[PDB]
Design goal:
By secondary structure, the protein is of the alpha+beta class. It has helices spanning 5-15, 69-78, and strands spanning 18-28, 32-40, 45-51, 59-62, 84-93, 96-104, 110-116, 122-126. Bound molecules: nickel (II) ion. The PDB classes it as structural genomics, unknown function.
């Protein structure tokens, strides 16, 4: 069992329309979020981002309301930033919902770009 996941899944079902949990992942950025993926009772795919901070607000969106994980990767590739695509995770910072796209950039350096979940706008490109 992964730290915080059982609690996050229960919090997601309690406070939203999520009925079934498929996966939970911890996302740690400026803040920590448990990203809970599943479906409502209608069977609609829903994402719920539950803050570790109990004072912060839970956010949820239907999956169909955001760009896909592949599209997030494609956005960064189409931006000409990628030598080797690596991974993508659903993510959040403050009240901004995000896809975090990781890749080796044009200098071979491991880099991260944050793409807006809804708009597909590249919000930040970081090379640690
Ligand atoms: Ni059901």
């Amino acid at each position: 069992k992964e730290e915080g996941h059982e609690a996050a899944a229960a919090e997601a079902k309690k406070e939203t329309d999520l009925a079934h949990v498929d996966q939970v992942e911890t996302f740690v950025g400026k803040e920590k979020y448990y990203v809970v993926k599943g479906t409502d009772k209608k069977g609609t795919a829903l994402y719920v981002w539950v803050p570790a901070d109990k004072k912060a607000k839970i956010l949820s969106k239907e999956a169909k309301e955001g760009i896909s994980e592949d599209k997030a990767a494609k956005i960064i590739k189409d931006e000409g930033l990628v030598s080797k695509q690596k991974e993508v995770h659903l993510a959040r910072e403050g009240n901004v919902l995000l896809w975090e796209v990781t890749y080796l950039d044009k200098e071979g350096q491991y880099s991260l770009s944050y793409v807006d979940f809804t708009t597909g706008k590249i919000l930040k490109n970081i090379t640690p």
